[PDB]
């Protein structure tokens, strides 16, 4: 067997021990691994091919295998008794020595010189804007009670999803770029990949919940007010987060959370299971994007057909808000102006709906800031559209499509996916006037006194 062929067989057998049930499955994997390590010892590496067989740098590689086999014979000693958990622990101790000391020989992967300075700058810029911007969002909702009650309790949950990724996986990846390889343990590796899972999948379901909320508030407005929103939204936020944790659990059994050297980050691997990725691409992207598209399609058609919009009085300047109605004159909140019977008059000057003009040009802050929440979704769609397309190609047939997918395109796709984590408070400030005011209000508060 070749040195390159034996290296691949030694790695996939190490993954078998993690997904193993019986100690016999562990013992079968370690016997296959011990024999593969011995055949690899009597083979010359391609990097140090010009080096002497008894060179001080080649003899050091020979001792590395003896220290690796040394870890295998201790691991099968535990497995022969019956202890699976005790043998899987020694198997990871061998996995750490195989990626740190045996990594000197060979290196099939050749990453371009641009994937390191871009990844680092992008993560620095993302982490910096994320920690400040998304913190201001948390602070603005906690202080202002008007915004908080206007269905923007989900924004705190969406901001927390964005914030957690900047505090734990992003700084470790930045260390992994500068140290060239995952400098942290296997424990921190799978955890970082899991934290990112919550942050991405949890954000999709936070956006959907917002789209359904803004769908039920604009369309079927009267039916909405009949349904309580007091204890309902903290329950919905709790539910979508527990739904995310459930959807992320098959990664632990399949073994899809591993270090990807192409993007220097420990993330989810698309080639680990074509069945699981199919669900991640369809059930956790294509399907929720489609239902959100249906939600905002019904809102934009109402704005286009000039449905519930503000109506200003051409006599006393009374602005009729469909979100408020005219409850004292019998017009319950949620009623459209086109639905109030002709006998209705202005509750200030007493002039009929005949002499009433509509407020042309919709503000982005209007209808629980539907235009701002729409942009948020469109931005999320653009950011995660290429990666889900790459995962879709692998889910169909990775025997020919996976090696054909360029490494450059993968990094470019992953760069957008990370950048999304800081973009949300930027669109809040640019489009929502109330958010813009609150951003200045927090900044001027701690800056002056
Ligand atoms: C449920 O399994 C997990 C588990 C962990 C995951 N981490 C990421 C991810 C994190 C940051 C930037 C881009 C992707 C995905 C999303 C990866 N999706 C695709 C289609 O490749 C992910 C999925
Ligand atoms: Zn009037």
In the reported structure, the alpha carbon of residue 329 is separated from the centroid of ligand 2 by a whole-number distance in angstroms of: 14
- Ligand 1 and 200: CB distance under 6 A: yes
CB 188 within 8 A of CB 172: yes
Experimentally, how was this structure solved? X-ray
Residues in the chain, overall count: 449
Instruction: Note the ligand closest to the C-alpha atom of 353.
Output: 2
Buried b (16+ CB within 10 A) or exposed e, 267-302: bbbbebbeebbeebbbebbeebbeebeebbeebeee
- Ligand 1 and 356: CB distance under 6 A: no
The CA-based diameter of the chain, rounded to the nearest angstrom, is 103
> Which helix H or strand E contains 170, and what residues bound it?
helix 169-178
CB 307 within 8 A of CB 323: no
φ, ψ (nearest 5 deg) of residue 267: -135, -165
Own/partner long-range contacts of 398-407 (Cβ < 8 Å, ≥24 apart): 398/270, 398/271, 398/274, 402/270, 402/271, 407/111, 407/112, 407/115, 407/262
Report which of 270, 276, 85, 98 is spatially closest to residue 186, judged by C-alpha positions.
Answer: 98
Q: Please choose from 127, 191, 194, 197 the residue to mutate so as to test ligand 1's pocket, defined by most ligand atoms within 8 A of CB.
A: 197
Query: 3-state DSSP call for residue 352?
Result: strand
φ, ψ (nearest 5 deg) of residue 312: -90, 145
> Which helix H or strand E contains 444, and what residues bound it?
helix 433-447
Among protein residues, the one with the nearest Cα to ligand 1's atom 14 is 417
CB 82 within 8 A of CB 37: no
CA–CA separation, 140 and 339 (whole Å): 36
Q: What is the CA radius of gyration of the chain?
A: 29
In the reported structure, the alpha carbon of residue 122 is separated from the centroid of ligand 1 by a whole-number distance in angstroms of: 18
* Spatial CB neighbours of 310, under 8 Å, sequence gap ≥ 6: 319, 320, 321, 322, 358, 359, 366
Report which of 235, 238, 233 is spatially closest to residue 368, judged by C-alpha positions.
Answer: 233
CA–CA separation, 353 and 306 (whole Å): 16
Query: 3-state DSSP call for residue 331?
Result: strand
Instruction: Note the ligand closest to the C-alpha atom of 315.
Output: 2
CA–CA separation, 201 and 379 (whole Å): 15
- Ligand 1 and 197: CB distance under 6 A: yes
Cα atoms in the Cβ-side hemisphere of radius 13 Å centred on 418: 28
CB 384 within 8 A of CB 200: yes
């Amino acid at each position: 067997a070749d040195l390159e062929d034996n290296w691949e067989t030694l790695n996939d057998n190490l993954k078998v021990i993690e997904k193993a049930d019986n100690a016999a499955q562990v013992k079968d994997a370690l016997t296959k691994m011990r024999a593969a390590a011995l055949d690899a010892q009597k083979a010359t590496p391609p990097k140090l091919e010009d080096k002497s067989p008894d060179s001080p740098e080649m003899k050091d590689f020979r001792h590395g295998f003896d220290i690796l086999v040394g870890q295998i014979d201790d691991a099968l000693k535990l497995a022969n008794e019956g202890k699976v958990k005790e043998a899987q622990a020694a198997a990871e101790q061998l996995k750490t020595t195989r990626n740190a000391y045996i990594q000197k020989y060979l290196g099939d992967g050749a990453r371009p010189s641009w994937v390191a300075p871009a990844l680092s700058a992008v993560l620095i810029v993302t982490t910096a804007v994320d920690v400040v911007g998304n913190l201001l969002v948390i602070l603005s909702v906690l202080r202002n009670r008007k915004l908080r009650n206007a269905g923007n309790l989900f924004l705190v949950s969406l901001a927390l999803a964005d914030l957690v990724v900047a505090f734990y996986p992003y700084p470790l990846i930045l260390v992994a770029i500068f140290y060239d390889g995952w400098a942290f343990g296997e424990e921190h590796c799978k955890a970082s990949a899991f934290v990112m899972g919550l942050s991405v999948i949890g954000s999709v379901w936070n956006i959907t919940a917002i789209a359904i909320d803004r769908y039920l508030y604009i369309c079927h407005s009267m039916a909405y007010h009949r349904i309580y929103r007091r204890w309902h939204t903290p329950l919905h936020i709790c539910l979508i987060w527990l739904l995310t944790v459930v959807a992320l659990l098959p990664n632990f059994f399949v073994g899809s959370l591993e270090y990807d050297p192409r993007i220097y980050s420990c993330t989810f691997i698309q080639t680990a299971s074509t069945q699981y990725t199919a669900a991640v691409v369809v059930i956790h992207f294509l399907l929720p994007i489609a239902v959100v598209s249906f939600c905002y399609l019904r809102i934009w058609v109402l704005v286009l057909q000039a449905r519930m919009k503000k109506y200003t009085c051409t006599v006393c300047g009374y602005i009729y808000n469909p979100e408020d109605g005219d409850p004292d004159n019998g017009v319950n909140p949620g009623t459209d102006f086109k639905d109030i019977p002709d006998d209705w008059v202005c509750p200030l000057c007493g002039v009929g709906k005949d002499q009433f003009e509509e407020v042309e040009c919709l503000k982005p802050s209007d209808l629980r800031s539907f235009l701002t929440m729409f942009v948020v979704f469109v931005i999320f769609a653009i950011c995660f559209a290429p990666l889900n397309c790459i995962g879709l190609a692998v889910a169909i047939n990775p025997q020919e499509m996976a090696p054909q997918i360029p490494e450059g395109l993968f990094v470019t796709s992953y760069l957008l996916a990370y950048f999304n984590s800081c973009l949300n408070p930027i669109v809040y400030g640019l489009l929502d006037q109330n958010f813009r005011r609150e951003y200045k209000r927090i900044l001027l508060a701690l800056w002056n006194p």
